[PDB]
Amino acid sequence: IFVYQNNITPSAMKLVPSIPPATIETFNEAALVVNITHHELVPKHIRLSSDEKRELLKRYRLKESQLPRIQRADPVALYLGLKRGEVVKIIRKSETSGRYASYRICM
Amino acid sequence: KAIPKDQRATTPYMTKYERARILGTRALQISMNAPVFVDLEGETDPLRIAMKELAEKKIPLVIRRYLPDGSFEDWSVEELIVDL
Amino acid sequence: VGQQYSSAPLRTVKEVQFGLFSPEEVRAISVAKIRFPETMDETQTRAKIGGLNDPRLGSIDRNLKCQTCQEGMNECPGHFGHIDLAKPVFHVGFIAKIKKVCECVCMHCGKLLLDEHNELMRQALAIKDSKKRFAAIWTLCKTKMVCETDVPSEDDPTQLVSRGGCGNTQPTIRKDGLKLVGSWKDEPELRVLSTEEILNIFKHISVKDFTSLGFNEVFSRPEWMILTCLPVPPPPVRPSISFNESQRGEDDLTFKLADILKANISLETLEHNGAPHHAIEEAESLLQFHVATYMDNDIAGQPQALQKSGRPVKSIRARLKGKEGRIRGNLMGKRVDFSARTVISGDPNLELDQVGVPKSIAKTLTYPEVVTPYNIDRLTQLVRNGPNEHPGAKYVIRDSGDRIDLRYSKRAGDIQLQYGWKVERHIMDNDPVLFNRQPSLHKMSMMAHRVKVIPYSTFRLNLSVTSPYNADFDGDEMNLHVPQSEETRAELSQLCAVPLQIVSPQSNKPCMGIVQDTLCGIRKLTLRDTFIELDQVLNMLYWVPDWDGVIPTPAIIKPKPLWSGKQILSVAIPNGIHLQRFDEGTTLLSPKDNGMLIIDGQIIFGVVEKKTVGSSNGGLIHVVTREKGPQVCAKLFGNIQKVVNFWLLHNGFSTGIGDTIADGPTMREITETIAEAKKKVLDVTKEAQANLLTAKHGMTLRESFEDNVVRFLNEARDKAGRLAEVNLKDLNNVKQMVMAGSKGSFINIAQMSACVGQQSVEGKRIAFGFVDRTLPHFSKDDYSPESKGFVENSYLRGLTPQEFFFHAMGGREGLIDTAVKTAETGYIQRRLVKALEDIMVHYDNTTRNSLGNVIQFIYGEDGMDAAHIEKQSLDTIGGSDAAFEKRYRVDLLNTDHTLDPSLLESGSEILGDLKLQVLLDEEYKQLVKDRKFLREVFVDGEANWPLPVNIRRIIQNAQQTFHIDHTKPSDLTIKDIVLGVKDLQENLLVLRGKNEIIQNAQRDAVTLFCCLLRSRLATRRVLQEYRLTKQAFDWVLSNIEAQFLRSVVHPGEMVGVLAAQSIGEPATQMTLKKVTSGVPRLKEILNVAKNMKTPSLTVYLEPGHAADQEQAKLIRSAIEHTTLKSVTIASEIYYDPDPRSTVIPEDEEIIQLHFSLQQSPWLLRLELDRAAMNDKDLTMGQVGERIKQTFKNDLFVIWSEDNDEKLIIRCRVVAEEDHMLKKIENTMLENITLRGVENIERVVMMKYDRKVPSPTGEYVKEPEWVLETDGVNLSEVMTVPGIDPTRIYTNSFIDIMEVLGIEAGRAALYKEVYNVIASDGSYVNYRHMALLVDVMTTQGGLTSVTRHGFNRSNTGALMRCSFEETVEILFEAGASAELDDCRGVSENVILGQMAPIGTGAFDVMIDEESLVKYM
Amino acid sequence: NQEDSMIMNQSSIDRGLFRSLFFRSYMDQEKKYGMSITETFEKPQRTNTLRMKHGTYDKLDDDGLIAPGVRVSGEDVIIGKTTPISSKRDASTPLRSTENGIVDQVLVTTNQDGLKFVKVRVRTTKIPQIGDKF
Ligand SMILES: [Mg+2]
Ligand SMILES: [Zn+2]
Ligand SMILES: [Zn+2]
């Protein structure tokens, strides 16, 4: 995780895919000032395991498709360090229920 | 391929839709001269006789409740609770 | 349905594999040779040749001859032909991908320029989307416009790959209507990329290569995008509409085929014979023209190619494009059989579910009943009456299907009917029909009634159904549709019946109310003051259709047997009903006859009106439907109307000019109220003239006066009408109307009896349409009350000529915006419903569609049927943590907290028990658990939430259906109560699942209801408050259980269509510290707008300092964008060649100060405004250092300080500088930010009234500071010390989701829509919007409710073509060999099939086994 | 009378309260082919071509017209035109299916070409109904 003041060279950031499988995450200081996630508007986002994700599709009878998909750039999907495929169990609240289980697949 | 009769997340109650189509298919068939599985107790309107059929729960219809994934579950008119 | 049997097996249309016609196949698939444009007749000799018509296609003139198929005219589907084109032609629309593929494929070898050696091309080849695989390949290969003979490998660069041959350059392809234009370069040679040359390359293209593009070697190849074989459409597509007999009648399509046929044999002449080459390209380009013309004429290619009539010629594109263009007016919409349109009239005698049907309409509309022994005999009477006597028959269909047209048959009286026959009998008394009042924007707009064959030519209807249909008896025109299938009339009677939709699922309230005469009569009767005498009473009691024939005890039997207006109304009200209302002026003794108390279908006190007999959530209407029944309550609408109106007929009512006149001095007092405010007008008028006006924040001085002058004129406009409002006695016939609510409002009284007021267009108080004056009858510069459009007169007094003209312009606006928004709203309905079409509720108890893509994992985040839900109250959130303790905590260890043996039979022994208090601990602790839970979901305290199963009503019924005497103690044990709920809590189910998640999101779903369950059925409240038995308690638990499992949403319910049909419907009714007022605001959010008409960022103060006035006083100028332009009066340039000495005397000493304690000859001096500076609070040193650090080391600053009155900042720099210094001042003012974040303008202060739980638990009011601003750029405005970077909200929903996750996006979008529901105050249950809000979210971001949001995604080729773009959408279905699921609505719609909607979802079969049992 | 409607005194309509009239005209010509072939204005009956309308031709005289004053019914012929082709096709014009009434004026002139022009009138007495607009 690189925490730069202004930016990084595009000459340098091409050295990000360079060391696989290890993933290199890049965040500017700017959005880190305030905790983007600790907001009123955003509910919990949970990194769901290989087995947790499979179980979701096996019980809720879904497909890699059918799922309500999530952005990769979602300030959450980078705060959690999410990668493509990962499931995000979201516990939002309801005006007519109290809690409801929503699931997103990262792109 | 389907799913068995044990393993049913499908509401054990008949849907207002299933009521309308059973009571309708019996309305069609009964007006279509079809056999009447209830005693015609003063009843002569096809659609009406079909209603006193769901009462005596002696309708031979079975509902194929398809799951949007692909597979399905079966329920007879007797099998469905009518709290409609 | 087709006519005449065929041994061919019948079936569904399960797939529609779209593709292209192989010019190879076109030929084979042809019966006709099509060679000449001599159409029909062989030289006027009435026949047809091997030409345009029947060279083997299908004959006209009621004849067979259709190449062996013959089958007359009906049952004869058209038979296609062919025509070989003299040179290949660019298929008009596929001309797109023709240019495109050409920029990817090497125009030499037929191989993609780029391949598996370029990493992003590899990235593209991998994309599993058929046209997005193209999307990247196109963007990629168009670039490298030279194919590589050799290129380096992915391993080492000195190591090359000879992959594919040819190193020849690609052209720069650009359109020219019918021929492409290349380009290669010394000097640019542009090649005429001709059809023949182009097609060739396309043939060569590697299978794998067109496969890596949007193509297919089975359904649609790119080599078929260019036509050599044109299929000749049969005549039932291009008819022969002959005049009498010896006259032509060919459709304009037959013309353009003839005009191609000419153009084919023209190119043949030049080709086959003497070649003219650069003259052959004319007959080629005209064939190329007419083949592109006959398909599309209405294109970008300027000539619409008008036929000699000036007609563009009926393009096969224009024949399929939107509304009445096949798809949207002949397929999605149709003109149907068994229909009737008639004028409407009111009725006080028909039941809610009955329809007025004139004799003639009943005699014109037929139903086919099947000759069965049940009917038969009576059908045989119908059969000997025909169509003259009301009950008769039009036709009699044999077992064979031969129409015995009763009307003219010779055996018409004989008719010996056999079974299995069908007698077409008239539609008659108490039969089912779909009655409808256009537009059909509501589920409720198209409902089913009961025929009641009346005389007199009008469609009559019950007056309570005047509201759900959008009715007004001003001669409204309504439709009627006669079902034929005994299955179809089962479909009306079970889901479409009027008694069913009494309760509106759309907003969880009933949508049928008692109106006008019944709305005023019932209130005029339900008074303490009104009574009736025996003779008239007996008529009233008899008038109830289902009256017991029991004479009720007259409340007064003293010197007259008298019956109160309420004791007779109680008769219609069904015994068992419970309704408690209460208001301000209610005290159970209700001096003001206020509130409403109806214990067991009998009135106690209160006055019946809108709050009871009106279409409201609490209203008697709603209560009776849930508490008694639907075809039970719809009876009650009738019972009441019949009786209230019988009394109204005899009491009488009238409204005349007598009502518009207020008592003598009140009318004088009115012109005192307008006069005192007219004095409050001149105050501001005199204040503004001498510039003493304290202009507010974000307000012009011109605006400041107008905004305030309007305030006092309208403050007095309101209180002027108020005078006459209560001055007009209890007797005022107009007051009486509005009293019940029947029709009218206070504003009416105001504009009729006191004063009209201010008239305005675009909000602007009628301004100076002339030179500074209002009208030519006015003085130049008159901002006066009457001048800018104020009316002091009431409609009664009569308006002045001026007071009348100003009333015209202000009214003018109220006619335009009607036409505008009623039409825009129309498009807004369309979009919502075409997007949310496919979407419904399924068997997994999930929300899916046309594929299976999930929206919600439980419908409505809860899983209930929209209307079953009544606004329930959560008692657990409320009170201080001490009030809660008294009401709920049971402590059978302490003497002062034990339920006394006056409450339960165990009360004296249940005390001091270990495990019994241990039990109760879970009870109170689970309530404290529930307390903060509900205090987390809603931190605004409010308990009045939409919750299914009215728990109140069940106990209400229990207390009077069990006659529980709160005298003796309840039988129950503490063990009975706590645990009795703990078991009920389980049997309340949504997702019936047996696993992990299905059990989990289930607990989640019924959490809130369970918190309400725990609030009412809590041990203390149960025995202390309720005193209910085990028997009653068990009834309370029992009735809640099944009432809840009824509340489960029914799998099939078109939840999507319904969400839209509850949004789109009340959007129409919208008549619209400054945003966009509902209607334009909606089109911003629905269309997803980033270019917001009113962008606004709202910041709450930093957690701690809520009420700190000074905190917002710092953040304000620290967030508000200040420019050098703001603080500067004038920027001048002098010529001061010396660095030290300044020739300026107004600066002569200023220098000598900030100097003592190489440089530019050109001086840049600029004067500042002291107020404008000491407005954002400034220093010359602030400004000075700001600019210093802007330009830095290349420009040096000197200035005069705040002490010095000449507010100057002098500046210089380090051959040519007159222009260069003049250049600087441009960037200086506009770009030099001085204070606050950019874009974020008018920073205004608000003392936002908050809601915080007090130090004692009490939910209390907290006045806190909030900075509301006219500026949006959150990106950094969030990173501020003085704000709550949790409460910080903005109008730009885009800017929310951008910086704070996608699940907060769903949020900003929802909040932004609910505050559009309040834009006309009206309600819509959370579920309808929360579905649409989830539609533009479940994608992964934000999507518009347009042809580039929902209509461009995943859904089948037909579900998308059904809206906005058609021919177009269907064209990419062809070339990219697309497929239709046949899974959505639109899919089955086209095919005329039973779609998987509600009744169509599940399939029904017969078990030989269950079938054999019965006998 | 609720939600804007209104009751009416028929015993007053009977005298002349909102009693009105309505008059409809009908147009047709003796259309020429040039080679001195004109459509015939008379009462055609089957014979040679039989391409005729279904209404009552029986009411019209032998100048291919009803004289004014006769009670017209619904779909009955008012204009009798025969179409000669190379006999009795037919292009007769009848009463508008919806309407009813009595013939008012039967006008016949010559056009700028001198083609037998017809102008028939249908005089109906429109009386206040149970759903008429006022
Ligand atoms: Mg209207
Ligand atoms: Zn045929
Ligand atoms: Zn090549």
UniProtKB/Swiss-Prot annotation, chain A:
Where is this chain primarily localised? nucleus
One Gene Ontology cellular component: nucleoplasm
**Keywords annotated in UniProt:** DNA-binding, DNA-directed RNA polymerase, Nucleus, Ribosome biogenesis, Transcription
Q: Which compartments does it reside in?
A: Nucleus
What GO molecular function annotations does the UniProt record carry, in alphabetical order?
DNA binding; DNA-directed RNA polymerase activity
Query: Which GO biological process annotations does it have?
Result: nucleolar large rRNA transcription by RNA polymerase I; ribosome biogenesis; RNA-templated transcription; termination of RNA polymerase I transcription; termination of RNA polymerase III transcription; transcription by RNA polymerase I; transcription by RNA polymerase II; transcription by RNA polymerase III
Q: Which domain of life is it from?
A: Eukaryota
What's this chain's function? DNA-dependent RNA polymerases catalyze the transcription of DNA into RNA using the four ribonucleoside triphosphates as substrates. Common component of RNA polymerases I, II and III which synthesize ribosomal RNA precursors, mRNA precursors and many functional non-coding RNAs, and small RNAs, such as 5S rRNA and tRNAs, respectively. Pol II is the central component of the basal RNA polymerase II transcription machinery. RNA polymerase complexes are composed of mobile elements that move relative to each other.
For this chain, the family text in UniProt reads:
Belongs to the archaeal Rpo5/eukaryotic RPB5 RNA polymerase subunit family.
Entry protein name: DNA-directed RNA polymerases I, II, and III subunit RPABC1
Organism listed in the record: Saccharomyces cerevisiae (strain ATCC 204508 / S288c) (Baker's yeast)
Its lineage reads:
Eukaryota, Fungi, Dikarya, Ascomycota, Saccharomycotina
UniProtKB/Swiss-Prot annotation, chain B:
Residue numbers spanned by region Leucine-zipper: 40-61
* Location (main, coarse): cytoplasm
GO molecular-function term, one example from the UniProt record: DNA-directed RNA polymerase activity
Q: Name one GO biological process term.
A: transcription by RNA polymerase I
Q: Which cysteines are joined by disulfide bonds?
A: none
Q: Which UniProt keywords apply?
A: Cytoplasm, DNA-directed RNA polymerase, Nucleus, Phosphoprotein, Ribosome biogenesis, Transcription
Q: Name one GO cellular component term.
A: nucleoplasm
Localization: Cytoplasm; Nucleus
Q: Which domain of life is it from?
A: Eukaryota
Other comments on record: Present with 6090 molecules/cell in log phase SD medium.
Q: What does this protein do?
A: DNA-dependent RNA polymerases catalyze the transcription of DNA into RNA using the four ribonucleoside triphosphates as substrates. Common component of RNA polymerases I, II and III which synthesize ribosomal RNA precursors, mRNA precursors and many functional non-coding RNAs, and small RNAs, such as 5S rRNA and tRNAs, respectively. Pol II is the central component of the basal RNA polymerase II transcription machinery. RNA polymerases are composed of mobile elements that move relative to each other.
- Family (UniProt): Belongs to the archaeal Rpo6/eukaryotic RPB6 RNA polymerase subunit family.
Q: This chain belongs to which protein, by name?
A: DNA-directed RNA polymerases I, II, and III subunit RPABC2
Q: What is the scientific name of the source organism?
A: Saccharomyces cerevisiae (strain ATCC 204508 / S288c)
Q: What is the lineage of its organism?
A: Eukaryota, Fungi, Dikarya, Ascomycota, Saccharomycotina
Q: What gene is behind this protein?
A: RPO26
From Swiss-Prot, chain C:
So which domain of life are we looking at? Eukaryota
User: Which residues of the sequence carry a binding annotation for Zn(2+) 1?
Assistant: 66, 69, 76, 79
Question: Which residues participate in Mg(2+) 1 binding?
Answer: 472, 474, 476
Q: Which residues form a coiled coil?
A: none
Q: Which GO terms describe its biological process?
A: RNA-templated transcription; transcription by RNA polymerase II; transcription elongation by RNA polymerase II; transcription initiation at RNA polymerase II promoter; translesion synthesis
Output the PTM entry: The tandem 7 residues repeats in the C-terminal domain (CTD) can be highly phosphorylated. The phosphorylation activates Pol II. Phosphorylation occurs mainly at residues 'Ser-2' and 'Ser-5' of the heptapeptide repeat. The phosphorylated form of Pol II appears to carry, on average, one phosphate per repeat. The phosphorylation state is believed to result from the balanced action of site-specific CTD kinases and phosphatases, and a 'CTD code' that specifies the position of Pol II within the transcription cycle has been proposed.
Keyword DNA-binding listed = yes
Q: Where does Zn(2+) 2 bind?
A: 106, 109, 147, 166
The terms describing its cellular component in GO are: cytoplasmic stress granule; mitochondrion; nucleus; RNA polymerase II, core complex
User: Which GO-annotated molecular functions does the record name?
Assistant: DNA binding; DNA-directed RNA polymerase activity; metal ion binding
Assigned EC number: 2.7.7.6
Q: Where is this region: Lid loop?
A: 239-251
Family the UniProt entry places it in: Belongs to the RNA polymerase beta' chain family.
Q: What is known of its domains?
A: The C-terminal domain (CTD) serves as a platform for assembly of factors that regulate transcription initiation, elongation, termination and mRNA processing.
In its UniProt entry, what is this protein called? Answer: DNA-directed RNA polymerase II subunit RPB1
Protein species of origin: Saccharomyces cerevisiae (strain ATCC 204508 / S288c)
Swiss-Prot record, chain D:
- General remark: The binding of ribonucleoside triphosphate to the RNA polymerase II transcribing complex probably involves a two-step mechanism. The initial binding seems to occur at the entry (E) site and involves a magnesium ion coordinated by three conserved aspartate residues of the two largest RNA Pol II subunits.
The UniProt similarity line reads:
Belongs to the RNA polymerase beta chain family.
Source taxon at top rank: Eukaryota
This chain's protein is named DNA-directed RNA polymerase II subunit RPB2
Quaternary assembly: Component of the RNA polymerase II (Pol II) complex consisting of 12 subunits.
Modified positions (Phosphoserine) in chain numbering: 86
Q: Which residues bind Mg(2+)?
A: 4
Q: Where in the cell is it found?
A: Nucleus
What does this protein's UniProt record list under function? DNA-dependent RNA polymerase catalyzes the transcription of DNA into RNA using the four ribonucleoside triphosphates as substrates. Second largest component of RNA polymerases II which synthesizes mRNA precursors and many functional non-coding RNAs. Proposed to contribute to the polymerase catalytic activity and forms the polymerase active center together with the largest subunit. Pol II is the central component of the basal RNA polymerase II transcription machinery.
As given in the record, the signal peptide range reads: none
